[PDB]
A paper describes a structure:
Hybrid clusters are metallo-cofactors constituted of a mixture of Fe atoms bridged with sulphur and oxygen atoms. The most notorious enzymes harbouring them as a prosthetic group are the hybrid cluster proteins (HCPs, also historically named prismane protein), which are present in strict or facultative anaerobic archaea and bacteria [e.g., the bacterium Desulfovibrio vulgaris and the archaeon Pyrococcus furiosus], and even a few unicellular eukaryotes [e.g., the microalga Chlamydomonas reinhardtii]. More recently, the HCP was shown to act as high-affinity nitric oxide (NO)-reductase, detoxifying NO into nitrous oxide N2O at physiological concentrations, and its overexpression protects cells against nitrosative stress. MtHCP is a monomeric 548-amino acid peptide organised in three domains (first domain residues 1–222, second domain 223–368, and third domain 369–548) harbouring a cubane [4Fe-4S] cluster and the hybrid cluster.
The native HCP from the thermophilic methanogen M. thermolithotrophicus (MtHCP) was purified anaerobically by multiple chromatography steps and immediately crystallised without freezing. The crystal structure was solved by single-wavelength anomalous dispersion at the Fe K-edge (SAD) and refined to a 1.45-Å resolution. Based on the nomenclature, MtHCP would belong to class I, coherently with cluster binding motif and its monomeric state confirmed in the crystal structure. The structure harbours a hybrid cluster in a [4Fe-3S] composition, matching the bacterial homologues in their reduced state. The active sites of MtHCP and the 1.25-Å resolution structure of the reduced DdHCP are superimposable. The main difference is a 1.0-Å shift of the “Y-atom” at the hybrid cluster vicinity, which has also been attributed to an oxygen atom in MtHCP based on the electron density. Because of the unequivocal chemical composition [4Fe 2μ3-S μ2-S (O)] of the hybrid cluster, we propose that the as-isolated MtHCP represents the reduced state (the nomenclature MtHCPred will be used below). A cavity analysis by the CAVER programme showed that the hydrophobic channels are also present in the MtHCPred structure. Five channels devoid of any water molecules were detected, spanning an overall distance of approximately 63-Å (tunnel length from the extremities of tunnels 1 and 5) within the enzyme from an edge to another. The channelling system connects the active site to several openings on the protein surface, and most of the side chains structuring the channels are hydrophobic (57/62), probably for repelling charged or polar molecules that would disturb the reaction.
Numbering used by the authors: 1 to 548
Write the structure that this text describes.
């Protein structure tokens, strides 16, 4: 028997920073949480069986990343959809096991690789079992390392999903995903071995973000400096949220000539920086702020909303009838975008509904400038280097990552406002919405907020830093005039963090709280070896990061 109805602590908003045990703060109900645990368990067992075979295939690789992504915060609240994904994984595992060359020989397999269920009732019973819970790992430090690795792997999986959607892949990354999953089932490993896998997860996070950067830029062009409207026009619109640029491509193609405009929301803002989307005159602008304001902003938008990935919050009744899910997203009673076997999506029902809607309510007017991904910044490298050498830019501050609901995140807005006028903020991810409309101006034409894009575009921030390290002939990335004051919420941010640690970045400030899934001993290593610190007060952190 489980000791509580559920247990989940994977996001920054976990109850009391110790764990959601009755209902998720995010709205994930206990039955859904337990089914997500079973989906992860099923994926681990599939990984075991494929690793025993010695090879995988494309359908298994895609299933694994999609199943992991299904369990990221604010992606899927639909117990029925999670049950079908569990059944799909069991079928793939049973198919794989039927191909074994040594039926019986391999040492006793873990229960995740052999459990079965022939009805939804039996699936639900297994989901409610102790063995699938996070707390099944009894030692606190092993549990912390296993969960930290798992959440990093979920972040990798999400980015790899998007690359695969675009026709890109890297089987070495999938191999690592399977290795890491299997490691969490292996009681022979020491904490040092798990620590090494966490660092390796950072290595593969860099490789995955490199692959997604390649996929997005080869498909849609390199981001370029762009002014994005944050006001509204006078036509019915469709609002697209999340991160999938291929969904946007198809939505724009299908809305051309219809009288329905398209707007972006939250992590779709960076689509406006890509040449392939800038070409459409009905692509109006970015509506609203980050994900956590969506109940009010989706209502005010009046038109339909298409959610391509996280973050989805349980919808208000006012717009439930006009919000659609695609990809791995799910919520009971929300309509899906129809999709064929080749990944082509049909937005016809959305467009017909949009034509009947009022235009969006104006929330604000003005522009956001962005598009400073790696190609664009490297094209300005002489100007950037000259400003560093003259002291016109004294420090860069990476404030990338995720936004969220906690009012403690007012810290990030006030930190940005208190930064001296010779500093530049480098950003990516929806954390940007705490400071991207502040009107901070420019330094010799270089804006004081440089938005490289989506959270995956932290890759560009790394590429930029490594280019500056080479230009200045420095042996250590940390010798650059760069500070890190990163905000996190969901598991892609864990992958980004691990990527930065693998790249050698020290003294990161991580906030607005530190994860619940770090045990005291694991947190101590992060502090002592990597210099990780939580936020304090704006004034104290400006002093320690900028003025000392
Ligand atoms: S995803 Fe976050 S808020 Fe939701 S149940 Fe897990 S820890 Fe709680
Ligand atoms: Fe891609 S950054 Fe992480 S929190 Fe939900 S959309 Fe935001
Ligand atoms: Mg061993
Ligand atoms: Mg190539
Ligand atoms: Mg309404
Ligand atoms: Mg329906």
């Amino acid at each position: 028997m489980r000791p509580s109805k559920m247990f989940c602590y994977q996001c920054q908003e976990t109850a009391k920073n110790t764990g959601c045990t009755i209902i998720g703060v995010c709205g994930k109900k206990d039955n859904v949480a337990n089914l997500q645990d079973l989906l992860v368990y099923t994926v681990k067992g599939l990984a075991v069986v494929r690793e025993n075979l010695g090879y995988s295939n494309d359908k298994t690789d895609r299933y694994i990343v999609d199943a992991l992504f299904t369990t990221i915060t604010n992606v899927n609240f639909d117990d029925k959809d999670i049950i079908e994904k569990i059944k799909e994984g069991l079928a793939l595992r049973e198919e794989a096991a039927s191909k074994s060359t040594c039926p019986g020989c391999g040492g006793d397999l873990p229960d995740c690789a052999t459990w079965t269920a022939d009805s939804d009732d039996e699936i639900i019973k297994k989901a409610n079992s102790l063995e699938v819970s996070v707390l099944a790992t009894e030692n606190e430090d092993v549990r912390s390392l296993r969960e930290l690795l798992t959440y990093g792997v979920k972040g990798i999986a999400a980015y790899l999903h998007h690359a695969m959607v675009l026709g890109y892949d890297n089987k070495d990354i999938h191999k690592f995903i399977r290795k890491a999953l299997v490691a969490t089932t292996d009681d022979s490993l020491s904490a040092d071995e798990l620590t090494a896998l966490v660092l390796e997860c950072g290595k593969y996070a860099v490789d995955t973000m490199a692959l997604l950067d390649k996929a997005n830029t080869e498909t849609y062009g390199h981001p370029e400096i762009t002014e994005v409207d944050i006001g509204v026009r006078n036509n019915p619109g469709i609002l697209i949220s999340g991160h999938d640029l291929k969904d946007l491509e198809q939505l724009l193609e299908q809305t051309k000539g219809t009288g329905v405009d398209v707007y972006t929301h939250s992590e779709m803002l960076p689509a406006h920086y890509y040449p392939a989307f800038k070409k459409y005159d009905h692509f109006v602008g970015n509506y609203g702020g980050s994900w956590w304001r969506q109940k009010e902003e989706f209502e005010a938008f009046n038109g339909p909303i298409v959610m391509t990935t996280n973050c989805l919050v349980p919808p208000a009744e006012s717009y439930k009838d006009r919000i659609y899910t695609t990809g791995v997203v799910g919520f009971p009673g929300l309509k899906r975008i129809p999709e064929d076997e080749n990944g082509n999506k049909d937005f016809s029902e959305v467009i017909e509904q949009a034509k009947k809607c009022a235009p969006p309510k104006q929330l604000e007017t003005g522009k956001i400038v962005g598009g400073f991904a790696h190609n664009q910044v490297l094209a300005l490298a002489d100007k950037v280097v000259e400003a560093v050498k003259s002291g016109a830019i004294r420090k860069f501050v990476v404030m990338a990552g995720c936004d969220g609901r906690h009012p403690s995140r007012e810290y990030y807005t006030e930190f940005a406002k208190k930064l001296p006028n010779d500093t530049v903020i480098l950003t990516a991810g929806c954390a940007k919405y705490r400071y991207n409309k502040l009107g901070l101006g420019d330094i010799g034409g270089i804006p004081r907020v440089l938005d490289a894009g989506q959270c995956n575009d932290c890759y560009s921030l790394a590429v930029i830093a490594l280019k500056l390290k080479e230009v200045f002939e420095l042996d250590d990335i940390n010798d650059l005039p760069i500070a890190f004051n990163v905000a996190w919420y969901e598991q892609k941010a864990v992958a980004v963090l691990l990527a930065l640690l693998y790249l050698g970045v020290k003294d990161i400030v991580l906030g607005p709280t530190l994860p619940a899934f770090l045990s005291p001993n694991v947190a101590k290593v992060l502090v002592e070896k990597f210099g990780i610190s939580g936020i304090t007060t704006v004034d104290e952190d400006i002093e320690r990061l900028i003025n000392k």
